[PDB]
Amino acid sequence: GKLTNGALEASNVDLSKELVNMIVAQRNYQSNAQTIKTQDQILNTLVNL
Amino acid sequence: GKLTNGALEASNVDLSKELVNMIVAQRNYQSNAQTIKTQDQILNTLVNL
Amino acid sequence: YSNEQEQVLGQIVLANFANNEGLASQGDNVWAATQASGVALLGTAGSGNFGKLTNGALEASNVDLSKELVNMIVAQRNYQSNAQTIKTQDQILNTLVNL
Amino acid sequence: YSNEQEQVLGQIVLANFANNEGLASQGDNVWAATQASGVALLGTAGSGNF
Amino acid sequence: SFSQAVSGLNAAATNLDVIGNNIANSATYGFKSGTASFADMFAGSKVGLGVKVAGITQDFTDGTTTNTGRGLDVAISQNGFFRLVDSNGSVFYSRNGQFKLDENRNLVNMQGMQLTGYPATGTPPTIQQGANPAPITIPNTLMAAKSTTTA
Amino acid sequence: SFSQAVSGLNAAATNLDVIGNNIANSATYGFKSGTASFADMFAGSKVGLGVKVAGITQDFTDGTTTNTGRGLDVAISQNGFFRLVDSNGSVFYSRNGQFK
Amino acid sequence: LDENRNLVNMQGMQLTGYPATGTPPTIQQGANPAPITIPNTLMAAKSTTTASMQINLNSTDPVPSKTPFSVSDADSYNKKGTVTVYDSQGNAHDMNVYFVKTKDNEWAVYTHDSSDPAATAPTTASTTLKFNENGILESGGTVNITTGTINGATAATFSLSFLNSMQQNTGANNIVATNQNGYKPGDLVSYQINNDGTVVGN
Amino acid sequence: SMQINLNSTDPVPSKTPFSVSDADSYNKKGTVTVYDSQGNAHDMNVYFVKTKDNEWAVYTHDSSDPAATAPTTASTTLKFNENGILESGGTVNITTGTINGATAATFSLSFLNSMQQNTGANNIVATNQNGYKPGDLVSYQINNDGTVVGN
Amino acid sequence: SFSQAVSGLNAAATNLDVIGNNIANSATYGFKSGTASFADMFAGSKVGLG
Numbered sequence: 001g002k003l004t005n006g007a008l009e010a011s012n013v014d015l016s017k018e019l020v021n022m023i024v025a026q027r028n029y030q031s032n033a034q035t036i037k038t039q040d041q042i043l044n045t046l047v048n049l
Numbered sequence: 050g051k052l053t054n055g056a057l058e059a060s061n062v063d064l065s066k067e068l069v070n071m072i073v074a075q076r077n078y079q080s081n082a083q084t085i086k087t088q089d090q091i092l093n094t095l096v097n098l
Numbered sequence: 099y100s101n102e103q104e105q106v107l108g109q110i111v112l113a114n115f116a117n118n119e120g121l122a123s124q125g126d127n128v129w130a131a132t133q134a135s136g137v138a139l140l141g142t143a144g145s146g147n148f149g150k151l152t153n154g155a156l157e158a159s160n161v162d163l164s165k166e167l168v169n170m171i172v173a174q175r176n177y178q179s180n181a182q183t184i185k186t187q188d189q190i191l192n193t194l195v196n197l
Numbered sequence: 198y199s200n201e202q203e204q205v206l207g208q209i210v211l212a213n214f215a216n217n218e219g220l221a222s223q224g225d226n227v228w229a230a231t232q233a234s235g236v237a238l239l240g241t242a243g244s245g246n247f
Numbered sequence: 248s249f250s251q252a253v254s255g256l257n258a259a260a261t262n263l264d265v266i267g268n269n270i271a272n273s274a275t276y277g278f279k280s281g282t283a284s285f286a287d288m289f290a291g292s293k294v295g296l297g298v299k300v301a302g303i304t305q306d307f308t309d310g311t312t313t314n315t316g317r318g319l320d321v322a323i324s325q326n327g328f329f330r331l332v333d334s335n336g337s338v339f340y341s342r343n344g345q346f347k348l349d350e351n352r353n354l355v356n357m358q359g360m361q362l363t364g365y366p367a368t369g370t371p372p373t374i375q376q377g378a379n380p381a382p383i384t385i386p387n388t389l390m391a392a393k394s395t396t397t398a
Numbered sequence: 399s400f401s402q403a404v405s406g407l408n409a410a411a412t413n414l415d416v417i418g419n420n421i422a423n424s425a426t427y428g429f430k431s432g433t434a435s436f437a438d439m440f441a442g443s444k445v446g447l448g449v450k451v452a453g454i455t456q457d458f459t460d461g462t463t464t465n466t467g468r469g470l471d472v473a474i475s476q477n478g479f480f481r482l483v484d485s486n487g488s489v490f491y492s493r494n495g496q497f498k
Numbered sequence: 499l500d501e502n503r504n505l506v507n508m509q510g511m512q513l514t515g516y517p518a519t520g521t522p523p524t525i526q527q528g529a530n531p532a533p534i535t536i537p538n539t540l541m542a543a544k545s546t547t548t549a550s551m552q553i554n555l556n557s558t559d560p561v562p563s564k565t566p567f568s569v570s571d572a573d574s575y576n577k578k579g580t581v582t583v584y585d586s587q588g589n590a591h592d593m594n595v596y597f598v599k600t601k602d603n604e605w606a607v608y609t610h611d612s613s614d615p616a617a618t619a620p621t622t623a624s625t626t627l628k629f630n631e632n633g634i635l636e637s638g639g640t641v642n643i644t645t646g647t648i649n650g651a652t653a654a655t656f657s658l659s660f661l662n663s664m665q666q667n668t669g670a671n672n673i674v675a676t677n678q679n680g681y682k683p684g685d686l687v688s689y690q691i692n693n694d695g696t697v698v699g700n
Numbered sequence: 701s702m703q704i705n706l707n708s709t710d711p712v713p714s715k716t717p718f719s720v721s722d723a724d725s726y727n728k729k730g731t732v733t734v735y736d737s738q739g740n741a742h743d744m745n746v747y748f749v750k751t752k753d754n755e756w757a758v759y760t761h762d763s764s765d766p767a768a769t770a771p772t773t774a775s776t777t778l779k780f781n782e783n784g785i786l787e788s789g790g791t792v793n794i795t796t797g798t799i800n801g802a803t804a805a806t807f808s809l810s811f812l813n814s815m816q817q818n819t820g821a822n823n824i825v826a827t828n829q830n831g832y833k834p835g836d837l838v839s840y841q842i843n844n845d846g847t848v849v850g851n
Numbered sequence: 852s853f854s855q856a857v858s859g860l861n862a863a864a865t866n867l868d869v870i871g872n873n874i875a876n877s878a879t880y881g882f883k884s885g886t887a888s889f890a891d892m893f894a895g896s897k898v899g900l901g
Binding site for chain 3: 248249251252253255256259260262263266267269270272273274275276277278279280304305306307308309310311312313314315316317318320321322323324325326327328329330331337338339340341342343344345358360362363364365366367371372373374376380381383384385386390392
């Protein structure tokens, strides 16, 4: 490509699109933690027999 | 078409239309943000069971 | 044309259906006729059972944002109520297992 | 290309099975053909059952 | 026993998804909103087994007509559907009237689907309102002249 | 679920970017406005998976002609495009008539 | 509205109701309920069997000057009116009715079909309207009228009525009401459900 | 089958005899796409020409066959009664041409339920035919009544 | 909702542009003034969109 003097190529990170993905990944992480807690209770109810 | 010498063709951007469309677009964006908020609350409710 | 004469190249055909609710949307603002919607009845604008065509204009969506937001609020509340029901059944089952 | 002319290099093939549920998953978002799924039918996109 | 609560949660989720989709397609020329229709599923007993979504019904009410102006743009009033064909000959219908001419001078919408209609044939060409609908073309070929036969 | 609202937000953001590009280019000789065209994404189910940006359409309406008094300034009325060549021989087309 | 033109719910069960039978169709409540359907079946035409023309007359009108009658000459008659009737194929017959004042309170009315180019112009009175001491129509209010035969369609004969017509010191002769029970073929345009449950197709 | 509505007020065309190229030589033209034994599409053109009130000569032509003979004899005659109902001539056996050696199809074309009254203009109510082309399996489904149907 | 006010604003802007163009040609031999013609945009509903 061409070179433009006196100019800089800024980053390509869009904040909006990122924040939304942050929310979605937070929800996924919490769901996985919930699954961990479920398996923990499974092992608990088996142990306390 | 014919060529007119000594003059330039200006842009066809009408400012009032752009402003009204901007107002509509922002509101739409806020409505979609409210939708995301609602679904986030839904997922929080289901996780916190 | 440039010879002070015009030609007709075609006439846009319109389609009408017995069952509008039966058309299955395929995306890309496009509908496909299926068994429930019946066969498409073809015709021209302004004749028979067809509305005329407006030139230089586009038809916008019929989605009102206020009604959508209020319905979203109501549906969120209903979803939370159902989640409360699920929690109730969870507590009942936990009580029975702890016996 | 730069000579104001395009050239094709190949076409992506699509495979459809008689039994999708019979495919044996190999991991890495990858499936393998098995006897339960049957022999894969090859074709091009947008035609037939593709 | 979650038979009812799970179904209710699924129905609420479906309704919420429909509402969100309606919100998202708010600026889609040619879009019609949708509404979920619910039905109960009593089965033998009187306990009300749950709920189910009987379907999703469109709202085919005409939207506001906005004079974008671009000549090719055509808005449709009252009943009717624009008829298109894909590259494989399948027939589709759409209320979106945003058209453009492609490289082969074929009237297509944004997705490249070829707009169809009654073609014209003969000299002078006449609209073949009977001829099976065909894709509409706008050739740029120079128009021949007709020798004077009646004055 | 989340996908529909995400697609709606992306489409609204694209529309707002198009509007911002148009409004920042209000004073630009030979510039044509842009408009985002959206399409839905139904796939099998009737739930309406979401919306997508079908494309961005330019508006090639003849703008107002403004005089400047320069002999090398010429504007194309009605249809027509200036044909230009760069250093590499690649061809280009532009409605702007500011030449030096 | 499903593909077979029946009114069904979301699950497909057909709505039932009292059907319409006869011409003109009316709801016959003595029958058992049947599924409601809305066909596109074009509606056929009805040749006219009864027509009505209520008109008010002026007492001060002088008798026509240019005897005898000619349908061409305007000064040969006091009034001219037009009623559109329909034959077996729905073709339009434009009956022109001509009023000539003969004596006091006595008005000869002539009938001529203008849609048929080969029809002869009437030369003899079709009817003589007689008005009493004060407008009150006295006799001659009903006349049998036969159409011409146009384009091979059956000529429609009908009873044309002048009931409740009055003749007093009104400013001029102008038509008040014209009605007829015939219509031309029509295609389905819309359908609606009234608050009384009737399904009506326009 | 071709159900059509004809206007009783149409004047008889001046340009005798009927010519496919001459638009003034006929009253109405319609098209029906039939399929032969191999599956080639034949666009049969049906022409209605009014001769005398309550009489319509019907001609047929094959628009897909480049070697089809020019129609010189009226294919059939529709006669409508004084009430506008069709009385005789509503059915005729018609044979198409031969394209690339494919066997021509002989089918009965029926104008049943066709009516001639004072409509707006000549409009074709409906057209249908029971032939089709080769088809490949696209989808399968199980309906409400248990029948399995492949589309 | 928004479309009604958008149409009203566009009509007002068109009228303003027409008036400004007429004023700009106050001294233009052979020029004839222009006037915009407006019409409502009822569509199905009794609200009368724009």
